[PDB]
């Protein structure tokens, strides 16, 4: 086949460019941000995804910088990166070589939705548990994804391993520094962001994870809507009208407005009868108006809903064993070390 | 209250400006296009919606021109229109005074979706029937809405009358003249448009009406997806991979590509068991790959699914009588006069 060679720089390395060859090139994605290709490394023969975006060269790329700093089992790994050309002359293009992952949580959920089936609770636990773990890690670096949603959760069919991807909106949130309110994706945008808050924290990702969980249990997005107001009405229909204090926690500029008082809708009636009580409990501790009242990602991992995954005799529906879910490092537990008593079961510590 | 007076020009009139006063002003909508206010006419005391958009004055407004030409019982009426100012100095703003309508098909469908209920078949018929009638009318003028979706279908709670609104994307399609492919709304975009066709016809609105119908029967959008490709995959999962001929009908530039052959999914399995056979039949005649094979709006009105509405003893769940659904004019039947034999029942002709 047509072999392409370039001098790429390793992702997690001392910045030492090297020759890299690849073939079997084919477009597998295209957006306003750029085109995404699939390729096979001539060396290892492994499949990779090449995300090509337009770079000004005069400004550093935030995504690249964030990625080159990440190294976790639940985060898409950045193999190499390099510059080139392609669309419209006299312009530099940044190419991100990431590991290729077959499916996404979104596509799997879709299969079940049109199959009139509910995703087995076992998978909901496996996926949510890994999502929170990736969140505990990026947050430990003070990094906020700002775009958590099913489409950005890559999955390995066989291993059932989940990897967070798409860091094109990620940013390091410095306590005491403004930030754009119109961030994240529609259905998954925290209430504070819909109210135009500018001093939000990483807790907006936990809200997004809660919407994800709820969607997996419901079979469809829990808070649909075209505009922010629509979104907020969907949220209020479930959580009820927020109190003045909750409103103050989200955006004090709305404290004195007198919103109609709508009664909250019981989480039990929201989901189906056969919904695990622990799932509902976990959901209510994630989808909280007050951002500081939401569970931390590390705390969510310790929640009872994930007890089954801590069972020594747990197995995947396909017979295989569950991915490594207890290899927590010091950096991962930094936020709350004591939790290691629960996060790491006895049959793993020794 | 604070009374505002202006010299507005009547919508369906000989262009004779007059004084108009109104109060009870309050924002009820805001978008990238402009702000929408609600007001009460000092004269009749009737409620109206004022859509204020930015106008260059150097270019005629397509929406205004299209609206001033429309006059139907199933189309939002344009009361008056005038110019003024508001946001950012030295700029002219066009204000559209339209009749105010309380709800939308989207909001009603939403109520049922979170109530775990299915919208009563009677309403599905009433709404779909009126939607097609508004389509038969605008199409008779060679006008294509290009943005049919639940949110643009206004409803009167009591009368159950439906009015099509939002003509900000409407355009007169001249046979043999290019047009933007990225038109309509996501979930409701015809296949030809997703394939980037530029010579599409008004039949794209009929596809959108079919997605609307399917959503009302399903309880959720039938073809979800973030991008076009995602949309197309959802469509293919239901209708099956399109044949070369169907592909040629949509966009000949894709004739020779060899797409994997996926088996169609039976419409019976798509909806729930208790779904009226006539609804499913109507749906399959609307959601057709070949745009020329789709039923015309006037033909859809004659479909058997709407027989119940032609029953002399038909009534609304609230006891009231059904809106005027047989007052078809010559202009409305122009497309296919003979159909008047079915469209207008015996207990109405005389």
């Amino acid at each position: 086949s047509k072999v392409t060679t370039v001098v790429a720089t390793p992702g997690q390395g001392p910045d030492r460019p090297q020759e890299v060859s690849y073939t079997d090139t084919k477009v597998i994605g295209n957006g306003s941000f750029g085109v995404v290709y699939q390729a096979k490394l001539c060396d290892s023969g492994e499949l990779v995804a090449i995300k090509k975006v337009l770079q000004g060269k005069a400004f550093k790329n935030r995504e690249l910088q964030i990625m080159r700093k990440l190294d976790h089992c639940n985060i898409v790994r950045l193999r190499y990166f390099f510059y080139s050309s392609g669309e419209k002359k006299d312009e530099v293009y940044l190419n991100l070589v990431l590991d290729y992952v077959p499916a996404t949580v979104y596509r799997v959920a879709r299969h079940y939705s049109r199959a009139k089936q509910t995703l087995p609770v076992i998978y909901v636990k496996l996926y949510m548990y890994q999502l929170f773990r990736s969140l505990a890690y990026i947050h430990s670096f003070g990094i906020c994804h700002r775009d958590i949603k099913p489409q950005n959760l890559l999955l390995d069919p066989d291993t059932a391993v989940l990897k967070l991807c798409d860091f094109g909106s990620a940013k390091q949130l410095v306590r005491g520094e403004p930030n754009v309110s119109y961030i994240c994706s529609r259905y998954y945008r925290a209430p504070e962001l819909i109210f135009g808050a500018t001093d939000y924290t990483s807790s907006i990702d936990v809200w997004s994870a809660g919407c994800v969980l709820a969607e997996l249990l419901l079979g469809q997005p829990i808070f649909p809507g075209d505009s922010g107001v629509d979104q907020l009405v969907e949220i209020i229909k479930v959580l009820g009208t927020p109190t003045r204090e909750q409103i103050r926690e989200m955006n004090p500029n709305y404290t004195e407005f007198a919103f109609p008082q709508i009664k909250a809708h019981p989480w039990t009636k929201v989901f189906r009868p056969r919904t695990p009580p622990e799932a509902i409990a976990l959901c209510s501790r994630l989808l909280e108006y007050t951002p500081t009242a939401r569970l931390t990602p590390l705390e969510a991992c310790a929640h009872s809903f994930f007890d089954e995954l801590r069972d020594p005799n747990v197995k995947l529906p396909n017979g295989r064993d569950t991915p490594a879910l207890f290899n927590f490092t010091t950096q991962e537990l930094s936020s709350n070390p004591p939790l290691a008593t629960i996060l790491i079961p006895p049959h793993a510590r020794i | 209250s604070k009374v505002t007076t202006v010299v507005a020009t009547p919508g369906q009139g000989p262009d004779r400006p007059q004084e108009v006063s109104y109060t009870d002003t309050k924002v009820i909508g805001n978008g990238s296009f402009g702000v929408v206010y609600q007001a009460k006419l000092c004269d009749s005391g009737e409620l109206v919606a004022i859509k204020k958009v930015l106008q260059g004055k150097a270019f005629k407004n397509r929406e205004l021109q299209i609206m001033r030409k429309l006059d139907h019982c199933n189309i939002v009426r344009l009361r008056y229109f005038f110019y003024s100012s508001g946001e950012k100095k030295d700029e002219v703003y066009l204000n559209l005074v339209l009749d105010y309508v309380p709800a939308t098909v989207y909001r009603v469908a939403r109520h049922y979706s979170r109530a775990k209920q299915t919208l009563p078949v009677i309403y599905v018929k009433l709404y779909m029937y009126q939607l097609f009638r508004s389509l038969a009318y605008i199409h008779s003028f060679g006008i294509c809405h290009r943005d049919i979706k639940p949110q643009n279908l206004l409803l009167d709670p009591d009368t159950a009358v439906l009015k099509l609104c939002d003509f900000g994307s409407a355009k007169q399609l001249v046979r043999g003249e290019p047009n933007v492919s990225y038109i309509c709304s996501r979930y409701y975009r015809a296949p030809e448009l997703i394939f980037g066709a530029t010579d599409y016809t008004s039949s794209i609105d009929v596809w959108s009406a079919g997605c609307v119908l399917a959503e009302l029967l399903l309880g959720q959008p039938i073809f979800p997806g973030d991008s076009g490709v995602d949309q197309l995959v959802e469509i293919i999962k239901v209708l099956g991979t399109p044949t070369r001929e169907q592909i040629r009908e949509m966009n000949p530039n894709y004739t020779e590509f060899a797409f994997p052959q996926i088996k169609a999914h039976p419409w019976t399995k798509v909806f729930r068991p208790r779904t009226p056979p006539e609804a499913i039949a109507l749906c399959s005649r609307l959601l057709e790959y070949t745009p020329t094979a789709r039923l015309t709006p006037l033909e859809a009105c004659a479909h058997s699914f709407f027989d119940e509405l032609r029953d002399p003893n038909v009534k609304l769940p609230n006891g009231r009588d059904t809106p005027a659904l047989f007052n078809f004019t010559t202009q409305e039947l122009s497309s296919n006069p003979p159909l008047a034999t079915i469209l207008i029942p015996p207990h109405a002709r005389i």
């Binding site: 922010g228 107001v229 009405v233 209020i236 709305y254 407005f257 919103f259 | 309050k26 709800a103």
Partner: peptide, 18 residues
């Protein structure tokens, strides 16, 4: 002006639902 207008819209919508 932003809060005031956003609030008005939200209030209008909530009054309809409730």
């Amino acid at each position: 002006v932003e809060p005031q207008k956003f609030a008005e819209e939200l209030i209008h919508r909530l009054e309809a639902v409730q």
